[PDB]
Structure 1
Amino acid sequence: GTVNWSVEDIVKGINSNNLESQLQATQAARKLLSREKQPPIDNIIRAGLIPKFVSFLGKTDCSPIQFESAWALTNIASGTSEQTKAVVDGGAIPAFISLLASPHAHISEQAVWALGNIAGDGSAFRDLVIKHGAIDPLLALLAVPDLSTLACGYLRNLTWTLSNLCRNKNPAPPLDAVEQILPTLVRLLHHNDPEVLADSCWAISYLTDGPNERIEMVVKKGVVPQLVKLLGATELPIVTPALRAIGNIVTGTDEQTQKVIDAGALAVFPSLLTNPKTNIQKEATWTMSNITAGRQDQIQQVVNHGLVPFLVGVLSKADFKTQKEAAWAITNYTSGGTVEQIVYLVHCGIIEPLMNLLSAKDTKIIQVILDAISNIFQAAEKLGETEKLSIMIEECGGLDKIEALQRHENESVYKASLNLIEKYFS
């Protein structure tokens, strides 16, 4: 019936002076826009149909045409930024917000989905959705005593949309909107459905991706223990944003970082640092590099949790981007650690994999590694053991790699390797 219409026939029907004819053609548009291979969005837009769809959103007397036009606009707003913009320019934002409280659940769900698509386009439209007042009615849809009585797709829909209201930067979302949304996010983070949990963790990762004041308003809600729990989930779609969020938080203050350690996060890291998914192992090592940039008593907890051999592990064999993160973790460790903490690091076998990485062509890692070697030599200086260190480095073939760094030229690299060869190695 309404299958595979041309855009011309859709236009003929929608332009008619007959509500049923308009409904039939709007449904035909919805089906065109719902096909998987190349839905003709630009053709629909060029025909001038967006304003008609938007006016149909307000037809309270005809809920099927509200539903059909809502679904059509949702699929257009899902497209390119230019196409999302056409939807906004047609006036759809307040028309959708008015539909959030519809007695028909399928229409309210459309409005949630479409507003998520619009907010999901970027910072300006996110902020414009907030200004038109979407947050209060969005949160009101979740005001039940037990989230478990809501339909599954329905709850995942609202969670996805809320996380888009948290998502982008330059600027980050308004402080007031964040504070308004956070309590609901905390509740969702405790819901038993893997998609809601994943989406909730993504939202938290967005909110922690900024300056320390932003991280603080999240940590103040008490979510770090729950995030650490999700960090140990079996589902990779949960683990990935939980680790992102956790990694964002330890970019903050030493006190914010200590909350992560206090919650038991370090115990999960033997698994994460050997995880078969490359990006999980990369972000775990990145996370370690920021914990080793903390206080000496925080470095010490890394020691007590047995994590230094795992750092030697990743430095020895990992994807190259992961190894670079491990190199950073080692330079931070040696820059902040005690003499004794540095000696332990050498006892675990850090020198050889460190030296082997001087063969890498990436200039910035070579800098980082040379810095680390310097910090370790300063430890041997206080113990009067520079010579034993030089012998270790020489025998594993490190000296040749440092020698060769001089024919290499970066102003700092060529330099740093000189100093080392003059100061030690006679």
Structure 2
Amino acid sequence: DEQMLKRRNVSNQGTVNWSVEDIVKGINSNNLESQLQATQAARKLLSREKQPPIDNIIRAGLIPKFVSFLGKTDCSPIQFESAWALTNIASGTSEQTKAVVDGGAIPAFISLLASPHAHISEQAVWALGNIAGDGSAFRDLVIKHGAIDPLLALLAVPDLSTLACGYLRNLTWTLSNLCRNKNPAPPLDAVEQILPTLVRLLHHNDPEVLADSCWAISYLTDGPNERIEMVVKKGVVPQLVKLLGATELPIVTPALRAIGNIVTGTDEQTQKVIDAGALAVFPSLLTNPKTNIQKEATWTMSNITAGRQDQIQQVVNHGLVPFLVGVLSKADFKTQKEAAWAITNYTSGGTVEQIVYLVHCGIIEPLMNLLSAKDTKIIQVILDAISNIFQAAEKLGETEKLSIMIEECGGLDKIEALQRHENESVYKASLNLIEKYF
């Protein structure tokens, strides 16, 4: 969703607004100092707020020279300027990032991580973040060059608070990019290696470190139950639930994504978020003003009602059913569709006493009105729900009572209509429902 993939660093008046050809003239000279100003001039071009000349710089064949300056231990200033310049080139398109990698920048940047000058090592952290952020291949390539050890060694301190705020945020961000992307997913052992530190960052007091830490965890929980388990096993669920109640949307968003990912796992994994007290935060999430938080919360809900009956009960006890009736009644269409799933799921695995409660909460009408939507999949999900409900009524000899209810709110004058729907799964379902109850 919204975590920045790549980031450009846009943070000696003689080195201002130089011409690319002037920059080439200086870097090609055999004067370390002349090369230094030329590189700073290049970095300033790449740091300008509007349209950095990334392609012009690449075309001039400066990347190889810049990457070579990274190794000039004797002249730290040029190491910094070229690191910053390469960082910004790497923040561009895939082809541009490829140019940096093709120049042999990865091993050079990993070497700078251990630099005595924190501003230089920070630029290396930043650059590697941009490279890994390009995709799976480069992320795994950064991992193969041995970047994880050096990065994690930068956070190996008794108290993260003694570290410079900006510095910590860059490391956290870059680390999250090493956890990012899914096809393929990060090496298992690389994830295992990073998790402990990630777990430590999830407890830091900075909103930006927390936001990115949550994003990283959300990426790790996005996949097979085996992946979810390595995370859940670290005991972060309770902390994730806490961040779920945060004031800052940038924290709640990734935190709700992680929790939503976790509940797509086993019922045992789902039970962990329930035990953490996650449900108590949903009355807020399900009415949240930001439509995406609401949609994701309803999607998460739909995966919790897809669990055991005792888990569907927890949903009932927290008074969340009326909130689902609310989201089904009025909300962004995509959120409504998620509400429909949450319902159809609830009705497919809940007890009769539970499906009865669902109806007493007023689910029938809003469910009907939604049959008036042009999205054959939702109409299917809803029809599946009505059938799952009649089924429970049949067991109480209250099918008639339900038939009338659907009749009162115009439901039948919609199902009969659907009976004449071009899809076999729909005009079939309506038929059955009709001829069987109506």
Measured against the shorter chain, the TM-score band is over 0.9
CA–CA distance in structure 1, aligned partners of residues 37 and 361 of structure 2: 73
Task: Specify the alignment match of 1:360 in structure 2.
Answer: 373
SS at structure 1 position matched to 2:395: helix
Return the offset for 1:333.
Answer: 0.3
| Counterpart-to-counterpart distance in 2, 1:307 and 1:68 | 55
Paired position in structure 2 for 1:66: 79
The match for 1:138 among 151, 161, 164 is: 151
Name the Cα RMSD after superposition.
0.5
Q: Distance in 1 between matches of 2:397 and 2:81?
A: 80
1:112 and 2:133 matched: no
Deviations 1:137-181 (A, max 9, x none): 100000110001001000001000000000001100000000000
Deviates more, 1:30-39 or 1:246-255: 30-39
Shift of 1:407: 2.5
Picking from 16, 19, 35, the partner of 1:3 is: 16
Match of 1:316 among 316, 324, 329: 329
Gaps of 5+ in 2: 1-13
Q: CA deviation at 1:408?
A: 2.2
Native 8 Å contact 2:267 2:307 kept in 1: yes
Deviations 1:102-154 (A, max 9, x none): 00111000000000000000000000000000000100000110001001000
Q: TM-score, normalised by structure 1?
A: 0.99
Indicate conservation of the 8 Å contact 2:419/2:429, yes or no: no
- Kindly provide the CA deviation profile for residues 299-323 of structure 1, in whole angstroms up to 9, marking residues without a partner as x: 0010011000000000000000000
Query: Structure 1, residues 270-303: CA drift from partner, whole Å, max 9, x if none?
Result: 0000000000000000000000000000000100
User: Deviation digits for residues 35-54 of structure 1, max 9, x if unmatched?
Assistant: 11111100000000000001
> Could you tell me how far 1:409 is from its partner in structure 2?
1.4
Maintained 8 Å contact 2:112/2:120:
yes
CA contact (8 A) 2:179 2:191 kept: yes
Partner SS state of residue 98, structure 1? helix
Residue 354 of structure 1: how far off its partner (Å): 0.2
> Given that residues 125 and 174 in structure 2 are in contact (C-alpha distance below 8 angstroms), is that contact kept between their aligned partners in structure 1?
yes
| Cα displacement string for residues 227-270 of structure 1 (whole angstroms, at most 9, x for unaligned residues) | 00000000100000000000000000000000000000000000
- Give how far 1:401 is off: 0.6
Partner of 2:5: none
- 1:30 paired with 2:24, answer no
Deviation at 1:406, TM superposition (A): 2.2
TM-score normalized by structure 2?
0.97
What is the alpha-carbon distance in structure 2 between the residues aligned to residue 247 and residue 150 of structure 1? 32
Q: Where does residue 195 of structure 2 map in the other structure? A: 182
Residue 5 of structure 1 aligns to a residue whose secondary structure is: coil
For residues 319 and 51 of structure 2, the distance between their equivalents in structure 1, rounded to whole angstroms, comes to: 53
Contact 2:253 2:293 in 1 (8 A): yes
Tell me the CA shift for residue 28 of structure 1.
0.5
Q: SS where residue 227 of structure 2 aligns? A: helix
Deviation at residue 34 of structure 1 after TM alignment: 0.5
Partner secondary structure for residue 4 of structure 1? coil
Residue matched to 1:331: 344
Q: Is the 8 A contact 2:264 2:270 kept in 1?
A: yes
Deviation at 1:351, TM superposition (A): 0.2
Query: Where does the alignment leave 5 or more consecutive residues of structure 1 unmatched?
Result: none
Partner-residue secondary structure (3-state), 2:146: coil
Distance 1:143 1:412 in 2: 58
Work out the CA distance in 2 between the residues paired with 1:21 and 1:397: 81
Q: Percent identity?
A: 100
Pairwise CA distance, 1:396: 1.0
Question: 2:179 touches 2:220 (CA, 8 Å); kept in 1?
Answer: yes
Measure, in 2, the Cα distance between the counterparts of 1:161 and 1:231: 23
Displacement over 6 Å in runs of 4+? none
What are the within-5 Å matches in structure 2 for residues 274-423 of structure 1? 274-423=287-436
Distance 1:83 1:397 in 2: 58
Q: Work out the CA distance in 2 between the residues paired with 1:89 and 1:178.
A: 26
